[PDB]
Design a protein around this ligand. Structure first.
Ligand SMILES: NC[C@@H](O)c1ccc(O)c(O)c1
Ligand SMILES: [Br-]
Ligand SMILES: [Br-]
Ligand SMILES: [Br-]
Ligand SMILES: [Br-]
Length: 302
């Protein structure tokens, strides 16, 4: 599933923190440390599960094989030669290669990896887009071609496919009101969005749990959603290019369309700042998101 670009690593780090940070007194202290690649407190289940989360999402720990996988490191270095020195990347990969088979529980995985993390902190940090200076440089080089920090993922895709100043821009008026278009350009755009919020995997597969995650975040039950998605999947088209559009269309035209639009609107807001829930997990309120999304509507469709 690697190599990973800066946005992909940002998604992984922030999602893992969102799912693993304690609530209450220790949250802010923990966050401050984890952000700096200080995986402490080492004795905390939250730190241990955070560590496991990152390792699993990157592929550095394979819970099926119950083994660490150093090939992720070499793939990352191959994609980003500027982010490592060969000898040091090799030393890091070697340390991972020589880790023993490890059980798939947070404590076991964290304990096995922690010595490697400490012995190869800078090497791993640089390679996996944790170096602020190096990452800033990559974002600047990439510019409009990658989702930027503090930019809505929806905005990123919209600008890519319906650029400002172009004769295409006007289509955003309908698009942002959940009008399902039929053309190649819209299918490409919808692919960009659906993959960007992880409803569709890099591997072009539906991720029902990600859709469910967003429903739960707007306080909706997911039984109907699962039934809808099950029906949608039995109608999945052969053309891989069309898959994201297929599920978007199916959801928008379905018996859960209102809940879907509510969940998708909130996701848009949260996609604008990946650390949305990190300092404190924010309670959801429908009217506040209503306001924000309407403001974005008037920005993209003036
Ligand atoms: N809130 C934005 C939402 O209406 C939307 C849905 C689908 C899109 O392809 C899009 O750009 C925006
Ligand atoms: Br702490
Ligand atoms: Br590079
Ligand atoms: Br961000
Ligand atoms: Br933060």
């Amino acid at each position: 599933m690697g190599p990973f670009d800066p946005e992909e690593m940002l998604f992984i780090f922030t999602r893992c923190m969102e799912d693993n940070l304690e609530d209450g007194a220790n949250r802010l202290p923990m966050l401050a440390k984890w952000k700096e690649w200080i995986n402490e407190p080492v004795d905390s289940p939250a730190t241990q599960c955070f560590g496991k989360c990152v390792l699993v999402r990157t592929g550095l720990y394979d819970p099926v094989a119950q083994k660490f996988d150093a090939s992720v490191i070499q793939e990352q270095f191959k994609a980003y030669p500027s982010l490592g020195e060969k000898s040091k990347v090799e030393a890091y990969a070697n340390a991972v290669k020589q880790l023993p088979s490890t059980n798939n529980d947070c404590a076991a995985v964290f304990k096995a990896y922690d010595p490697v993390h400490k012995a190869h902190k800078d090497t791993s940090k640089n390679l996996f887009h944790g170096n602020k200076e190096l990452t800033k440089g990559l974002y600047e080089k990439l510019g409009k071609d990658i989702r930027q920090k503090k930019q809505s993922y929806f905005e990123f895709c919209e600008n890519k496919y319906y650029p400002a100043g172009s004769d295409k821009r006007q289509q955003l008026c309908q698009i942002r009101q959940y009008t399902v278009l039929d053309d190649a350009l819209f299918k490409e755009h919808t692919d960009c969005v659906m993959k960007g919020i992880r409803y569709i995997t890099k591997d072009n597969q539906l991720d029902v749990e990600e859709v469910k995650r967003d429903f739960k975040l707007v306080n909706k039950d997911t039984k109907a959603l699962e039934e809808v998605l099950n029906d949608c999947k039995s109608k999945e088209p052969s053309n891989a290019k069309e898959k994201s559009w297929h599920y978007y269309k199916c959801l928008v035209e379905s018996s859960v369309k209102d809940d879907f639009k509510e969940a998708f609107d909130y996701r848009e807001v949260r996609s604008q700042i990946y650390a949305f829930n990190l300092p404190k997990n924010q309670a959801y309120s429908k009217p506040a998101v209503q306001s924000q999304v309407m403001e974005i509507d008037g920005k993209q469709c003036p």
